[PDB]
Copies of this chain bind each other. A is one copy, B any other.
């Protein structure tokens, strides 16, 4: 402290060391958009081709839900049993659990369940994965020539690119969009009755002829003596071409005219699945979703991947061009450009405020060295704690440009003051001044970490968001007061100019700031004033409570956000067709939507990625989804040219004009979180009941909540409602007669209409599948059932209509389970200005109006909200107590802390003022902001209260005289700090361009807060101080003429 005054070089060395650590930690520090925030979930997925909802729910789903146990830290189980044969069991774990352990343990209980599965599922694959819906990129591959189909392209994807990109530095998970080439063999029902054959015979034919064989070796061990030759018996090799599959022999006819497979079926290299069709502006396309590697450079993973893709550009086939429908990268690059712009802008402002106020170039340079240094270092402390440059942490730093700016200003000011007041040369001046502010500053460090640390401890995904802020800011601050104590006092004692005693430079110069008088008169005005306002304090205690009450009202009205919705350069629109619809209808709708975007939005849109089959609801021809890419924002000027009005005019288009519901929206900021003002209700069956009764209970609760539009709003299920299905009752009696095997009946019906993955081959070097399914025109409408024949042991064919009863009924196409038992998921939010928690209470009281065997429970968003929500009071209680205790220590008082803690309202009010006059919302940013403001306001209170006491004691001055003196000397720096600040933050508040959502959320609260805080504080702080001090002691007193200095 006093130490580094006489050691400017040791100070420089600590500076330089921290700077080098900064630049070093800055070069090699990750960049991601946001940090890891979702409470880890592993996904088990199994595809059971052909299976209906109940078949996967009962054969795979429940057998795995029953063998999942003994895995550490299980929060809940959620299960999709989809009628496209797919099962998705999503195990979401307690937050911050080892993803690695969760995945492996889950999978090791799964491999224990593996033999208890059907063999179709066992061979199709059950996969355990770590769930992130946040793909760094979706890279598109298209074909302009018109040459290639979806699967053609897809195959090229899988066999030329998919894994060369998967090399590039920064790439973790690689995923392909579409389906790879399989041996697609399409049976003909006529040409199968012709030569008297069923699927089973096709099947064993294909297994037998297309395989490897456990061979042997010449000259093997043990040998015979004198041996000399050793080589490998090459046995049966699998079939390379489609032709060679045509050649496979099903049966020989009696006269020798033989039957090769080609005759009974159409044969082709085809897709392994044809559920989803991917169009890129109508153009044939497949895709690849690349993930940023588990903690690496987003922007350099992007630069490397795009550079790598182009090395493959000279070896890409005809008319094959690459495209980028979804790109986190330019939005993050631009986020960062604006954080660097802001911090350096704020800093420049500080130079203008500091010069055009102290007019000493060497005084002006000091903070210019002071916070860059705190900057670099702050980076280094976060580097050490394992963090990255994402949005939350960088705005975590901007959010505290002010405490840093303040820290420097406080000191330089106080020194310049000591010289202008006392005439001391600079060295002795900096010791007098550090001697003055040192203890206070350690105090500010203890009150600032007393407010900023309780906000590091929240639980669930909210706590994560906060932890980033807590540590960024506590570290900027910690290193800030450290710099404040080591270097800058050395920089004041070492490059600061001596001021002639009582200089003040009134007039003394023509071409620059007659201002000094203009400042001076006024600062006397300020104190001329203040004593009068002390002279009858009464009114202000009224005014104060007025304001305090107001602060509350204005506050209770502020709406309760989570984060601002950002125009990401990218938004999407999804399509839901009526029940049971076909690939063709949905595909029509996607085509229309695309035309609308590319035309009636020709100034804006750049790309549509129409995807048929994948929709928001779940899987099925039924659903459709479109990724809509916009041009770069320097080509989208106006208000009606940006995502807000674009999405609004797109749903405008598609609502009023269709037979199907097609909605458009922009993605949320953090790609997986709560809708803030709502919930996610799962209605559960705990007693022994079937789907009928549970859905009935669901409808009952659906109506019971439509009866409260005053609390609850748009209470809906998130799934597919019962569609009609087609039951084929096999009368085993009839087929028990005809000499057919029930096996062959089931499995021919199967391999016909659902299909059969049967065997494996080797295409051009890469192993791929062999599928056998009926051709198109012989398996579409229930009539085609007839065209299909099963052969008995006695040689006689049988039509299906000979033993197949058939009807229509309903069935559920999507069977959900919650924690092992049948459930139906109810989404919902609360009516406008009603609490989410209230809606939750009314929900529990409504679902309590349901039959026994119907129970309820909470998940995800409303899960973390029902456990962690009583923390907000307790942590700021710890905060209040810890700060009060800290000040009590810094002074030597159980009462004086009150005149400074009382300043806190004075700052909150303007931010609320500001929220409302800017129509913004109480989101996270506003709140970290709240604190920041409270922070400076309190710091200033602390320095005023200190100087007051310091006079009162260590000069003998009296209460009023000394509070006057105090406030007097602290007027100029508050004003300097506040100007540089309000002027640094200013650009945030009025700025559009990517991440303006954030910048505005921040800026508003701060600027308003700063305004009402300084302009209030400079009149209330002496009153707090003066009033509170009159309840202590009982005498000795008001007071002066005292005494030692000893």
Contact = CB atoms under 8 A, between A and B. Distances in A.
Interface stretch (A76-84, A707-715, A935-943): A76-84
Contacts of A63: 767
Interface in A99-149: 100-101, 103-105, 107-108, 111-116, 119-120, 122-123, 125-130, 134-145, 147-148
Given A115-B122, A223-B780, A753-B233, A50 B215 contact: yes
Contacts of A229: 580, 582, 780-781
B135 A326 contact: yes
Contact of A77 (B75, B138, B167): B167
B233 A9 contact: no
Interface string A225-264: 1111111111111100000000001000000000000000
A329 interface: yes
Nearest to A689: B315
B50 A213 contact: yes
Contacts of A1041: none
B885 A13 contact: yes
A750 B216 contact: yes
A43 interface: no
B51 A214 contact: yes
B167 A215 contact: no
Contacts of A273: 221
Contacts of A326: 135, 137-138
B70 A160 contact: no
B107 A108 contact: yes
B309 A161 contact: yes
Contacts of A100: 72, 101, 105
Contact of A9 (B69, B122, B889): B889
A752 interface: yes
Interface stretch (A293-301, A404-412, A639-647): A293-301
A738 interface: no
Interface string A265-305: 00000010111000000000000000101110000111011
Interface stretch (A188-196, A523-531, A850-858): A850-858
A667 interface: no
Nearest to A858: B76
* Residue from A70, A122, A237, A859 with most neighbouring chain B CB atoms (10 Å): A70
B852 A234 contact: no
A139 B214 contact: no
Nearest to A159: B688
A845 interface: no
A69 B859 contact: no
A348 interface: no
A706 interface: no
Contact of A322 (B141, B218, B317, B749): B141
B156 A323 contact: no
A234 B726 contact: yes
Interface stretch (A378-386, A727-735, A995-1003): A727-735
A457 interface: no
Contact of A72 (B73, B169, B779): B169
A144 B321 contact: yes
Contacts of A209: 732, 742
A420 interface: no
Contacts of A216: 50, 749-750, 752-755, 779
Contacts of A987: none
Given A235-B746, A753-B217, A762 B892 contact: no
B889 A746 contact: no
Given A139-B305, A170-B304, A746-B236, A145 B318 contact: yes
Contacts of A325: 138, 140
Contacts of A344: none
Contacts of A169: 71-74, 94, 301, 304
A535 interface: no
A56 to B, nearest CB: 9
A820 interface: yes
B137 A226 contact: no
Nearest to A70: B172
Contacts of A314: 686, 852, 855
B213 A322 contact: no
B51 A318 contact: no
A973 interface: no
Given A78-B859, A219-B582, A137 B319 contact: no
13 contacts: A52-B232, A139-B305, A139-B309, A140-B324, A142-B323, A143-B318, A143-B320, A168-B308, A208-B742, A213-B749, A217-B753, A218-B753, A222-B271
Given A69-B163, A214-B750, 9 more contacts: A66-B163, A67-B125, A139-B322, A144-B321, A163-B820, A168-B304, A218-B753, A228-B584, A234-B725
